[PDB]
Amino acid sequence: GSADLAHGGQVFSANCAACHLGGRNVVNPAKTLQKADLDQYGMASIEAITTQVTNGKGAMPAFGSKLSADDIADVASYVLDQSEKGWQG
Amino acid sequence: GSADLAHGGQVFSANCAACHLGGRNVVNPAKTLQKADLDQYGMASIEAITTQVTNGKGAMPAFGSKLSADDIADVASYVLDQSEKGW
Ligand code: HEC
Ligand code: HEC
């Protein structure tokens, strides 16, 4: 596909899969990356995901000082794309 | 003392149990709060626990901007005390 989504998947594996492998949320099981959960909590957008990745929230760490702006844009795109695809395989 | 440990337990329930319930570690089972693990990684002290809680590490979030210094001292004392008596 696109370069952005591919790089987003690498940012995801290295920074997010520890808690969200395959769209899970092993820490807070009510707040997964499945589309229904993103929709329930108003997180089904690039800007909302970007805000939470940048600032952290609750038990989720912040990445705003550790990732580049492009890294965060790409990982947000990857999450939204995988969520729309049902985190298939 | 007893006051510190009691408040530490409340800070722990509100901020740490999501990942460390009963002294475990839902994200990385190799790095629990059990005495053997704290000893292995040099984390079996108020100073070490305070630092990690304040700064975060890896997938563990930082709490230094969200908790008072007293909150962090107390939760550190709680964790050390639980580890010594076995969670
Ligand atoms: C474990 C330490 C995590 C890391 C690593 C990542 N996330 Fe996370 N995420 C975690 C928690 C505990 C929560 C809920 C926070 C709360 O209190 O509300 C979240 C939530 C999200 C969400 C929203 C999910 C939803 O509302 O259903 C998103 C979109 C999200 N997380 C993305 C994300 C990214 C992109 C990560 C790597 C940069 C990442 N998380 C890491 C726990 C953890
Ligand atoms: C999930 C989002 C966590 C939250 C909430 C808390 N901790 Fe944590 N802890 C977590 C991880 C992923 C790790 C290992 C980090 C690494 O990469 O090395 C830890 C580690 C600790 C340790 C050291 C344990 C050991 O070395 O065996 C301690 C003492 C510790 N965590 C304490 C602690 C406190 C007091 C918390 C609430 C304020 C807390 N953690 C929350 C994951 C998560």
Side-chain angles (χ1 to χ4, degrees), chain A residues 19 27 58-61, chain B residues 11-12 15-20 25-28 30-34 36-39 41-43 48-49 52-53 57-61 63 67 75-76 79:
Chain A
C19 305
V27 174
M60 178 166 152
Chain B
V11 174
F12 187 91
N15 294 280
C16 318
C19 297
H20 294 300
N25 185 334
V26 76
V27 181
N28 185 1
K31 293 182 183 188
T32 75
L33 312 191
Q34 300 173 283
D37 281 353
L38 299 181
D39 287 349
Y41 301 111
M43 298 291 299
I49 296 164
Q52 182 133 329
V53 170
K57 180 180 176 56
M60 178 168 150
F63 294 86
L67 298 178
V75 79
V79 166

Side-chain angles (χ1 to χ4, degrees), chain A residues 9 12-27 32-34 78-79 82 86-87 89, chain B residues 27:
Chain A
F12 190 86
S13 303
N15 296 280
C16 319
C19 305
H20 296 297
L21 186 70
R24 292 170 174 91
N25 185 337
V26 303
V27 174
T32 75
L33 313 186
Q34 303 171 285
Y78 175 79
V79 166
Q82 287 301 302
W87 290 94
Chain B
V27 181

Side-chain angles (χ1 to χ4, degrees), chain A residues 18-87:
Chain A
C19 305
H20 296 297
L21 186 70
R24 292 170 174 91
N25 185 337
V26 303
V27 174
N28 185 343
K31 294 183 173 177
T32 75
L33 313 186
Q34 303 171 285
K35 187 181 177 291
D37 281 355
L38 298 182
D39 288 339
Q40 174 177 359
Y41 300 112
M43 295 294 297
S45 70
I46 298 303
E47 65 80 20
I49 295 168
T50 295
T51 290
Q52 188 139 321
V53 172
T54 301
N55 298 336
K57 179 175 190 180
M60 178 166 152
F63 297 82
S65 65
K66 286 157 182 51
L67 297 181
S68 68
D70 289 354
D71 287 342
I72 294 175
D74 293 349
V75 78
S77 299
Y78 175 79
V79 166
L80 200 59
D81 183 67
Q82 287 301 302
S83 190
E84 289 166 8
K85 292 176 182 165
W87 290 94

